Design a protein around this ligand. Structure first.
Ligand code: OTA
Ligand code: CL
Ligand code: CL
Ligand code: CL
Ligand code: CL
Length: 279
């Protein structure tokens, strides 16, 4: 039933037109805090900002700002923190947000360098013996182990609040073959990765929201979250065929701008939802 619409859009070739409709209809809320002069160096892209109403606030006293938004999908009963790839000066902020929000999983959908440009700082340690200290936010981060698969990596990190010596296990779910402004190589590989995240226990109701990021926290991250939310809704509605992926995406865009950055990412989200609804 959802693939009938999909086949019609494909036959008509109207993915670009459907996508531009969504861009035209999407919410426009203020981002005054993100645009304050004092926050210029905390934003990776001048055209990608969190709305004031949904931005994550840091709890230490001098500047509360991070480029991160809480997406609260009330009907699907899931919230996500979508954020940009941290900058070299915001890695301490990133881990402070992870600590304060009680998240236990971080989903990374990009590589640190893509097409020869830096897209995200090296915000976690690559070597067990070379831990990272974030002196500004009083946190230490140690690589405990990595489970490296052919197209993604799952890392066990230990995040320690150096003030209290409390430690927490953070799982890092790193999708390494998703090109910027592009799509996964198959719905099956995307779905197997999504299922690994969802079965990991990182998304339990006793924990804070999962953190999802790409370079900007909108294109790949929006594609991931739209598919995950729509699959939750289909497993949750009495009538699963009533799930309208365009309506869901517009709902998500009330909480962060620009979610899904190409018409092919929109097409892929439909495809992943169709394939996953079967499995
Ligand atoms: O990383 C993503 O999937 C993503 O949305 N990236 C985005 S969105 C976006 C940019 C990028 C980028 O990576 O260059 C450049 C500035 N315009 C908006
Ligand atoms: Cl200012
Ligand atoms: Cl700060
Ligand atoms: Cl990388
Ligand atoms: Cl957009």
């Amino acid at each position: 039933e959802m693939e009938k619409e999909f086949e019609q859009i494909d036959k008509s070739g109207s993915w670009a037109a459907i996508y531009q409709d969504i861009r035209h209809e999407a919410s426009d809320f203020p981002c005054r805090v993100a645009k304050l002069p004092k926050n210029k160096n905390r934003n990776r892209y001048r055209d990608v900002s969190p709305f004031d109403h949904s931005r994550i606030k840091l709890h230490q006293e001098d500047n509360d700002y991070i480029n991160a938004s809480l997406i609260k999908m009330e009907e699907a009963q899931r919230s996500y923190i979508l954020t940009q790839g941290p900058l070299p000066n915001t890695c301490g902020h990133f881990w402070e947000m992870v600590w304060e929000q009680k998240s236990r999983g971080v989903v990374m959908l990009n590589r640190v360098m893509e097409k020869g440009s830096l897209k995200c700082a090296q915000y976690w340690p690559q070597k067990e013996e070379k831990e990272m200290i974030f002196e500004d936010t009083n946190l230490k981060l140690t690589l405990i182990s990595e489970d490296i698969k052919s197209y993604y990596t799952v890392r066990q990190l230990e995040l320690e609040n150096l003030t209290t010596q409390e430690t927490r296990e953070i799982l890092h779910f790193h999708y390494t073959t998703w090109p910027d402004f592009g799509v996964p190589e198959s719905p099956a590989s995307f779905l197997n990765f999504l299922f690994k995240v969802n079965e990991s226990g990182s998304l339990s109701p006793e924990h804070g929201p999962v953190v999802v990021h790409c370079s900007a926290g909108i294109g790949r991250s929006g594609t991931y979250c739209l598919a995950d939310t729509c699959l939750l809704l289909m497993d949750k509605r009495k009538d699963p065929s009533s799930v309208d992926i365009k309506k869901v995406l517009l709902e998500m865009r009330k909480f962060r701008m620009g979610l899904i950055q190409t018409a092919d990412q929109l097409r892929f989200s439909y495809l992943a939802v169709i394939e996953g609804a079967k499995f």
